Structures are given as structure tokens and as C-alpha cells.
Design a protein around this ligand. Sequence first.
Ligand SMILES: OC[C@@H](O)CO[C@@H]1O[C@H](CO)[C@H](O)[C@H](O)[C@H]1O
Ligand SMILES: [Ca+2]
Ligand code: NA
Length: 305
Amino acid sequence: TRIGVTIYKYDDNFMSVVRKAIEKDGKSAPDVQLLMNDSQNDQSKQNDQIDVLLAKGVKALAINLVDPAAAGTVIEKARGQNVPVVFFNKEPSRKALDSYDKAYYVGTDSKESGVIQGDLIAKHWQANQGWDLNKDGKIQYVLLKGEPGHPDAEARTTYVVKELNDKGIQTEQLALDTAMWDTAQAKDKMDAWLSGPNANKIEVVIANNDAMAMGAVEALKAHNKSSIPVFGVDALPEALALVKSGAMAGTVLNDANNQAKATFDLAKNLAEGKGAADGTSWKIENKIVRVPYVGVDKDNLSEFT
Ligand SMILES: OC[C@@H](O)CO[C@@H]1O[C@H](CO)[C@H](O)[C@H](O)[C@H]1O
Ligand SMILES: [Ca+2]
Ligand code: NA
């Protein structure tokens, strides 16, 4: 039973955790062979890789899209051989998922991590009045965003601020830009902000993920401004270490193990012509599985590392 798998780019920290977990599942299944592909952050490369997989005769595809909007294209490729597709990590439109009897998605409730992140920030903000550098009762923040259009970048960005505001904490956006989930790009964007006229007004750094938080931490260090708190999402090992050291104030566990597990289980079942959830406890709703996030910081760090 051969299963084709595309990872939008191996360079991506969190998808690295997910990929290795999926591979472990594959190694362990004596009956399954995974054909692993690095799409190198290029959807056209991914589309070509999918053609090759289907030419080689896979029984299922597990696809981590470069561009969420290419779901329809990928589905139409898979339809040619009636191959099931389990999309994961970047959610297609409901319209695209609904276009095929055998298109599934494994992910998260995107808004949830923004809400959890906003609650962590609110908690530390209240506990650390010194953070309010200009004493106006508001958080002056900058935000490092994920890929524009990515449902998680959009949700995390919207809901982190909405949650703070709903909890009665007013906020002011000094700047926002995308660092595309990437550590190095984030370092450069944070560097620029620390080198501009608004430098000394920045009170909190909000990042849509840990990789970008990590870039900001490096930049803060280069500028002698490590007193500015940094929040992320994912709970990468490296980020958990920064939480322990106080170089990050909080993050959110993105459950790579269960997302990898559900992706593999559904793909394998569908490869065999079985119901997607056969022999599992997954709750599939309109062909979608979602795995909870959990907040992590100094106060509960012990439960994760
Ligand atoms: O909601 C699906 C969840 O797996 C998305 O996770 C994010 O996925 C991004 C790439 O799609 C990137 O890996 C980032 O660090 C992750 O937080
Ligand atoms: Ca302030
Ligand atoms: Na195997």
C-alpha cells in the first residue's frame, strides 16, 4: 500500500515535527510505504510531484499544500484515478473539500490558538505592569504574521487582538508584517522595527508562530531590548527552552503528534477503501478532523518538557 505525501517545505519548523511523526507511523506499518516529497515552498513543484506520484500508482495522497487555494487543482488530479486525498496543516476552502467524495482535512480549530495566546498575554500583562512602558493602559504591540491567506495566520492574528480587547485590554498596533512562518525573515522584520522611530514604544511582540518568535528574540538581543516580551504558537522544543529561560513569555502547544497520527490513520484507511475513521477514535465532521491547542508558559511548563 503506497501513500504519496507532500510537505509544503521541509524547511518549516513545525511541519518538520509533523513530517517525522508521520514517517514514524509509516516505518511501523509493515504493509505501508510512504513516498515522501519536499515541495520546496513552490506549489508548481508540488503539482508536478503529485503527477509523478499518481503516475507511480499510489492508493492515497496526504497533501500539505503550499497554497491553500490549490486544493481544487490537486483534487482534480486525484480524481483521475479515484485516489483519496487527505489534506493536512493548511486548510482548503469548505467548497474545495466538498467538491470531492474522498477529500479530507486534518488540522485544528484555527481561532482557538489566537484566543489562548490572547489570554496568555492578558495574564502576563496584568502581572507585569512594568511592561506598560508609556503608562497609557494600552498594549503597544507589533505583530509578526504567518503567510497571508493561511487560515491560521488570519485567525491567530485576528483572535489574539480580539481576545485581549474582549478581556478589557485596549491595544495599539505599531506595526504588522508577514515573516511567512520563517525565523530568518522574522529576525529581519523585528530588526527593522527595532531600528525605526517607533523602537522605544514597542511593549509586546506577538508572533503567529514560534519560528517567527525565535527570530524576534534574536533581534531583540542584537538591540539590547530583551526586556520586551515575546509570545508565539506551536510549542517547538526550542521555544519551550526559551520559555524556561524567560526569553519567551508564552506559546501554545500545536499538537503535531495527533495531527500526524490522524493524517496517517485516515490516509491508510482510505488507501484500503475503508471508512476514514475505521479502527480509530477520530471524530470526523464533514470530512474534517480538528486537534485541540493548549496554552504553555512558565506556570505550567512542566507538563510539556
Ligand atoms: O491548523 C493546522 C496547524 O497544523 C497549522 O500549524 C501552522 O502551520 C504553518 C505551516 O502551514 C507553520 O508550520 C506554523 O508554525 C504552524 O503553527
Ligand atoms: Ca502602553
Ligand atoms: Na512501512
